Amino acid sequence: MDASSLSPQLQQVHGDRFYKRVNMLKDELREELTRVYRLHDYDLFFVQSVRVGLVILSHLFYKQETSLCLAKHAHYKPISELFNSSVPGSVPIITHVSPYTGEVNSLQDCKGKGVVDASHSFATNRHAELIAESSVFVAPLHKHASLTVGLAIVALRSEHFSTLMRSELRLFEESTSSDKPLEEALDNVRSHSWQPFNVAQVRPVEIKDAAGMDFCSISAPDLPFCCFPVPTLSATRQQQVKKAGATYFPHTNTVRLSCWVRGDGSQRVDMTKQVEQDLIALWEG
Amino acid sequence: MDASSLSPQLQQVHGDRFYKRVNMLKDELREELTRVYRLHDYDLFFVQSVRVGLVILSHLFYKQETSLCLAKHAHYKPISELFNSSSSVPGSVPIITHVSPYTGEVNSLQDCKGKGVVDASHSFATNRHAELIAESSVFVAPLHKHASLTVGLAIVALRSEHFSTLMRSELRLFEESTSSDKPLEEALDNVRSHSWQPFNVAQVRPVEIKDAAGMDFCSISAPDLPFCCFPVPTLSATRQQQVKKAGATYFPHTNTVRLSCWVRGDGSQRVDMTKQVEQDLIALWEGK
């Protein structure tokens, strides 16, 4: 290939037909993702990440005089900052499941539209609802999908978008990207040891006596993780949280405990009691 | 780390400190690039690609009631489609294509108010690098062309004194969006290697071949670029196969063929490949 299209030294390591190879790898992964996640009703587009997908969508929506703005609920902090204060038309960004409280929101507004951040529903026990009702969603592949780092999908419900709009996103998907995320995802999706879902279900937890004191989970049931109101923590507490593999969100005053059980989706695994044990243990050494 | 933050299986392969490690690799590469490419006047942000950079910029500019519009000249075709409807109120900011990939034409680096976001794909890490970094307010450069670093990584460079902390903080927060470590490691490995040199120092002056295989060729590309672009007739399947076989590129939308050179150096010495291109062009039109 012309030296001006791709460094010759890069061609040696990534292939002298690099662009076609990445297009073919995208094609392969798109077909695997469509079958395992059952995404036949969607056109899928690869983008780097959830926030990249959102900004591409914002631009394409604005080219049709439609603005993309935040729904009135909690969103991933970086997303609520990037789209704070965002002509006539309006499509809300919907956080399906909050990473901080586990709250769950409705997948469309009052007029059937909505771009869903599916980070904590894609490839979980909530995947079927996401895919039954969403017009658009955006999902990373490094969380519950357990595929790769630095790759996400934008999924457009096919009957809902014009060929024009899908064309433009397909043309944008051609923007120079690494082959490595694609090859990792493909290696994982074709692996005998990989399974598509985190099937952990955690129901409401109330351990009303951990050092005398009360914890009461606030997260939706059947998520793979569990979020509890806490006081503002000492550093000692924060060291235990971190060491335990849980997560402190100061801005919501929650800690999140999470499970990880892989399966094919046909069977959920109740891990309620394990989170309970794990909460008491964290607050007690 | 929390299984909800990053797959445990992915942690096993990339590390349980993945996000911090990627941030640290970015920090290292930003210092390496600033030194080798003399970017002390700029704040650098990593993004996937030129178009991702342009889409983020377009959002951040909108949040301050500024439009990002195409300047009136030819752009990379995907870019002219992506921004085809955007616009002109003086305050708007043009996207400028420093060096066109199709003709090698060069455009001026600023608005008549000193402004503009420059697509530097064919100037970054070439003989026009010093002009780019002397003049641009903002540029966007890929790292897989003349920089020869990696695939899947580009930089947005904001002239530091031109932008508010607030806007830079937004872009820094965007650069944190989940990305692969592999483009960063490749770039860092290249930029610190003995093998690698930072610039394509090939210089091609104007080339004119009178009547070679039935026709005359006269180059249209600005001089001192590493590549050379020539008007051509709508080509035959046969002609197009020879172009591709040769490692040249046919652009039907402009009726040009591009011939390119590739000579690596540290920038202290340019290498004139004028005579090579002319010889190569006669040869392409003879099957050899």
- DSSP, residue by residue, B119-162: E-TTTTTSTTHHHHHHH-SEEEEESSSTT---SS-EEEEEEGGG
The residue to which tokens 């001192």 are assigned = B224
Q: Which of B151, B225, B242, B264 has the most A C-beta neighbours within 10 Å, making it the best mutation to test the interface with A?
A: B151
Flag whether residue B7 sits within 8 Å of chain A, measured between CB atoms. yes
Question: Measured in whole angstroms, how far is the alpha carbon of residue B209 from the centre of its chain?
Answer: 30
- A3 — contact with chain B (CB < 8 Å)? yes
Yes or no: say if B120 and B96 are a contact pair by the CB < 8 Å rule.
no
Q: How far apart are CA A80 and CA A86, in angstroms?
A: 10
Check: CB of residue B67 under 8 Å from CB of residue B86.
yes
Distance between A265 CA and the closest CA of chain B, angstroms: 17
Would you call B85 helix, strand, or coil by DSSP?
Answer: coil
Rounded Cα distance between B193 and A254, Å, is 46
For CATH 3.40.640.10, list the domain ranges present in chain A: 8-189
Q: Which helix (H) or strand (E) holds B47?
A: strand B42-47
**CB-closest option in B5, B10, B78 to A146:** B10
10 Å CB burial of residue A112 (0-12, 13-18, 19+) is exposed
Q: Give which of A223, A224, A251, A228 is closest to A241, Cα–Cα.
A: A228
Note whether B228 and B259 are within 8 A (CB). yes
In angstroms, rounded to a whole number, what is the distance separating the alpha carbons of residues A106 and A130?
10
Helix (H) or strand (E) holding A128: helix A127-133
DSSP conformation class of B102: T
Beta-carbon contacts of A189 under 8 Å, excluding residues fewer than 6 positions away, are A29, A32, A33, A36, A147
Nearest CA in chain A to B121: A4
Question: Closest Cα of chain B to A178: distance in Å?
Answer: 4
Cα distance between residue A65 and residue A54, in whole Å: 16
Strand segments, DSSP code E, in A60-181 are 66-70, 89-95, 115-117, 136-140, 152-157
CB under 8 Å to B188, separation ≥6 — which residues? B25, B28, B29, B32
**Residue among A7, A145, A259 minimizing CB distance to B145:** A7
> What distance in Å separates the CA atoms of residue A142 and residue A163, rounded to the nearest whole number?
29
Closest C-alpha among A44, A16, A22 to residue A182:
A22
The full length of chain A comes to: 285
Q: First and final CA of chain A: distance in angstroms?
A: 60
Residues of chain A positioned with their CB less than 8 A from the CB of B271: none
CA torsion sign for A227, A233, A238, A244 is negative
**CATH 3.40.640.10 spans which residues of chain B?**
8-191
Answer yes or no: are the C-beta atoms of A102 and A92 closer than 8 Å. no
| A12 touches B at CB < 8 Å | no
Cα A56 from Cα A76, distance rounded (Å): 18
Residue environment code for A141-175, b if the CB has 16+ CB neighbours within 10 A, otherwise e: bbbbbbbbbbbbbbbbbeeebeeebeebbeebbeb
Query: Alpha-carbon dihedral of residues B168, B171, B173, B177, nearest 10 degrees?
Result: -160
Q: Determine, for residues B182 and A177 on separate chains, whether the beta-carbon distance falls below 8 Å.
A: no
Could you tell me how far CA A75 lies from the centroid of its own chain? Answer: 12
CB contact (8 A) between residue A177 and residue B151: yes
The angle, 0 to 180 degrees and rounded to 10, between the axes of the packed helices A50-62 and A163-173 is 140
Cα separation, B6 vs A145, in Å, equals 10
- Tokens at residue B52, please? 């991702």
Query: DSSP label at B236?
Result: P
Put simply, whether B10 touches A (Cβ < 8 Å) is yes
Compute the nearest-CA separation of A211 from chain B (Å).
24
Q: Are strands A269-270 and A262-263 parallel, antiparallel or unpaired?
A: unpaired
Fold classified for A8-189: Aspartate Aminotransferase; domain 2 (3.40.640)
Q: Which of B18, B78, B227 sits opposite A171 (nearest CB)?
A: B78
CB B201, CB A196: distance < 8 Å: no
Which residues face B130 on adjacent strands? none
Q: How far is A190 from chain B (nearest CA, A)?
A: 15
DSSP A193-253: T--SEE-EEB---EEE-SSS-EEE--SPTTBSEEEEE-PPPPHHHHHHHHHHT-EEETTTT
d(CA B198, CA B39): 13
Q: How far is A255 from chain B (nearest CA, A)?
A: 11
Residue A279 DSSP SS3: helix
Contact A69, A229 (CB under 8 A): no
Residue partners of B24: CB distance under 8 A and separation at least 6:
none
**Which of B177, B251, B264 to substitute to test the interface with A, most A CBs within 10 Å?**
B177
List all residues of chain A from 250 to 269 with a beta carbon under 8 Å from chain B. 256, 258-260
Instruction: Give me the phi and psi of B96, to 5 degrees please.
Output: -110, 130
B227 in contact with A at a CB cutoff of 8 Å? yes
Beta partners for residue B265, in sequence order: B199
Instruction: Let me know: does A255 contact A229? Beta carbons within 8 Å.
Output: no
Residues in B touching A101 (Cβ below 8 Å): none
| Rounded CA separation B61/B277 (Å) | 42
CA distance B224 to A29: 42
Mapped onto helix, strand or coil, the DSSP state of residue A39 is coil
Angle at A61 between CA B64 and CA B85, to 5 degrees: 75
Q: Which amino acid does the sequence have at A143?
A: K
| CA-based nearest distance A134→chain B, Å | 22
Cα separation of A150 and B218, whole Å?
45
Smallest Cβ–Cβ distance between B181 and the set A8, A63, A149 belongs to A149
Decide if A178 and B183 are in contact by the 8 Å CB cutoff. yes
Any idea which architecture B8-191 has in CATH? 3-Layer(aba) Sandwich (3.40)
What is the C-alpha to C-alpha distance for residues A199 and A196, in angstroms, rounded to an integer?
9
Residue A250 contacts by C-beta under 8 Å, 6 or more apart in sequence?
A232
Give me the amino acid identity at A108.
Q
Using CA atoms in the order B68, B73, B74, B77, what is the torsion angle rounded to 10 degrees? 20
What residues of chain A lie within 8 A of the CB of B125, using their CB? none
Distance, CA of A3 to CA of A95 (rounded, Å) = 44
Give dist(CA B19, CA B41) in Å, integer. 27
Residues of A in Cβ contact (< 8 Å) with B122: 4
CB of B162 within 8 A of CB of B186? no
Tell me how long chain B is.
288
Q: Which residue has the tokens 């969380």?
A: A143
Alpha-carbon span B156 to B48, nearest angstrom: 10
b/e sequence B128-156, b meaning 16+ C-beta within 10 Å = bbeebbebbbbbbbbbbbbbbbbbbbbbb
Closest CA to A201 of A226, A220, A223: A223
Crossing angle of helices B274-284 and B237-246, in 10° steps, is: 140
> Packing angle between helix B50-62 and helix A50-62, nearest 10 degrees?
60
Q: How crowded is residue A214: how many other Cβ atoms within 10 Å of its Cβ?
A: 12
A140 chain-B contacts, CB cut-off 8 A? 178
Q: Contact B54/B82 with Cβ under 8 angstroms?
A: yes
The 10 Å Cβ neighbour count of residue A69 is 15
CB contact A236 to B (< 8 Å)? no
Interchain contact, B59 vs A58, CB within 8 Å: yes
Asked if B128 has any chain A CB less than 8 Å from its own CB, the reply is: no
CB-CB: which of A2, A5, A143 is closest to B4?
A143
Using the beta-carbon criterion (under 8 Å), do A8 and B262 form an inter-chain contact?
A: yes
Cα distance from B4 to chain A (closest Cα, Å)?
6
Per-residue tokens: A123: 């490839």
* A-chain residue closest to B185, CA distance: A180
| CB contact B123 to A (< 8 Å) | no
Q: How far is CA A159 from CA A25, A65, A165, B135, in A?
A: 25, 20, 12, 47
User: Torsion angle of alpha carbons B235, B236, B237, B243, nearest 10°?
Assistant: -50
Which residues share a beta bridge with B200?
B264
Q: B272: which strand partners?
A: B203
Question: Is residue B110 classed as helix, strand or coil in its secondary structure?
Answer: coil
Q: Give the C-alpha separation, A220 to A137, whole Å.
A: 20
Inter-residue contact A69 to A94 (CB < 8 Å):
no
Among B180, B226, B260, beta carbon nearest to A149:
B180
Give per-residue burial for A269-281: e unless 16+ CB within 10 Å, then b.
bebbebbbebbee
d(CA A125, CA A200): 8
> Is the CB of residue A61 less than 8 Å away from at least one CB of chain B?
no
C-alpha to C-alpha distance for B148 and B187, rounded to whole angstroms: 8
Is A227 within 8 Å of A254 (Cβ atoms)?
yes
Q: Residue B227 in contact with residue B101, Cβ under 8 Å?
A: no
Q: In what order do the strands lie in the sheet with A247-249?
A: A225-229, A254-258, A247-249
Whole-angstrom distance, CA of residue B221 vs CA of residue B225: 8
Q: Show the beta-strand stretches assigned E in B54-103.
A: 68-70, 93-97
Interruption sites in chain A after residues (C→N beyond 2.5 Å)? 86
Report phi then psi at A135, rounded to 5.
-85, -50
